[PDB]
Amino acid sequence: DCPSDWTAYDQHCYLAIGEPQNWYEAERFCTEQAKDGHLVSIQSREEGNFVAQLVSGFMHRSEIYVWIGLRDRREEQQCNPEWNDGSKIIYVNWKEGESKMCQGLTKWTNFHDWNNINCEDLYPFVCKFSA
Amino acid sequence: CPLGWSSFDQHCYKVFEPVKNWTEAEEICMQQHKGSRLASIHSSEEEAFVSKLASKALKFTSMWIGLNNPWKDCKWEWSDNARFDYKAWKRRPYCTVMVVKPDRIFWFTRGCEKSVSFVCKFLT
Numbered sequence: 001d002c003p004s005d006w007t008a009y010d011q012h013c014y015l016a017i018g019e020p021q022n023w024y025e026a027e028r029f030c031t032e033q034a035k036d037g038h039l040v041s042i043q044s045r046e047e048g049n050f051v052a053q054l055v056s057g058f059m060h061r062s063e064i065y066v067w068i069g070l071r072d073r074r075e076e077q078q079c080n081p082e083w084n085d086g087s088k089i090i091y092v093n094w095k096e097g098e099s100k101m102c103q104g105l106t107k108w109t110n111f112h113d114w115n116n117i118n119c120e121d122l123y124p125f126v127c128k129f130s131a
Numbered sequence: 132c133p134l135g136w137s138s139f140d141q142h143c144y145k146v147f148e149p150v151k152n153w154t155e156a157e158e159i160c161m162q163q164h165k166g167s168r169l170a171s172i173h174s175s176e177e178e179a180f181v182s183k184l185a186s187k188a189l190k191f192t193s194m195w196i197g198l199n200n201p202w203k204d205c206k207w208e209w210s211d212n213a214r215f216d217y218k219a220w221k222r223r224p225y226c227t228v229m230v231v232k233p234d235r236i237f238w239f240t241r242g243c244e245k246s247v248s249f250v251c252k253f254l255t
């Protein structure tokens with residue numbers, strides 16, 4: 001079983017959270033609101049369909065993404081180590097929102113596919129923990 | 132530098148207006164001269180120069196620079212530390228555009244298939 005209104009799937013409990021938070025705040029919320037909780041990890045197509053159905057209610061809202069627990073943890077604002085000419089990428093000048101190192105489910109695919117987006121942006125999310 | 136090219140710290144630059152997707156722009160740069168490719172931008176000073184140069188050549192001052200796929204070689208990890216294998220991240224190749232505004236300069240990404248003006252650079 002799962003507590004309160006959490007939904008069960010393959011031995012884990014999940015909960016969709018409507019109040020938007022940035023990726024870091026969402027992860028923290030999941031760690032605080034559930035024993036050993038974290039933003040959802042999606043390890044198979046089946047789990048993805050389950051999560052997409054779990055957040056089907058967000059299809060009516062304006063938010064185009066839903067946070068999942070995937071991100072590139074580096075300090076840098078992007079991953080590619082070099083420019084086209086081989087020189088190192090050090091200096092960068094991205095517009096606000098253009099460094100996208102965290103991932104979320106996409107509204108266009110009814111929340112099945114994932115896209116890398118701005119970690120500081122605010123979106124609803126999904127928590128998961130082991131029962 | 133040759134006719135049409137501008138000099139800055141031992142390099143030669145030139146902005147091309149006719150729009151092209153990133154790969155054809157890169158090819159066109161390589162054709163113009165030895166060691167020429169879409170410009171890498173290594174500092175705010177180099178950036179400022181290239182920007183003023185673009186403003187003279189482009190009515191719509193947006194241009195491809197030499198950064199294709201900023202998300203090449205990322206290391207995606209799950210916050211619960213589960214192993215990363217299955218993935219539904221399917222972003223196609225995106226490329227970098229430098230935009231010049233009256234009050235600032237910034238970069239953003241666009242599908243590499245889009246058509247944008249561009250700027251070339253080579254070591255004199």
Ligand SMILES: *[C@@H]1O[C@H](CO)[C@@H](O)[C@H](O)[C@H]1NC(C)=O
Pocket residue numbers: 152153154155243244245
């Ligand atoms: C860029 O244009 C060339 C020739 O038109 C084409 O072969 C190439 O695939 C295009 N690149 C993209 C990303 O569409």
Ligand SMILES: [Cl-]
Pocket residue numbers: 209210
């Ligand atoms: Cl993490």
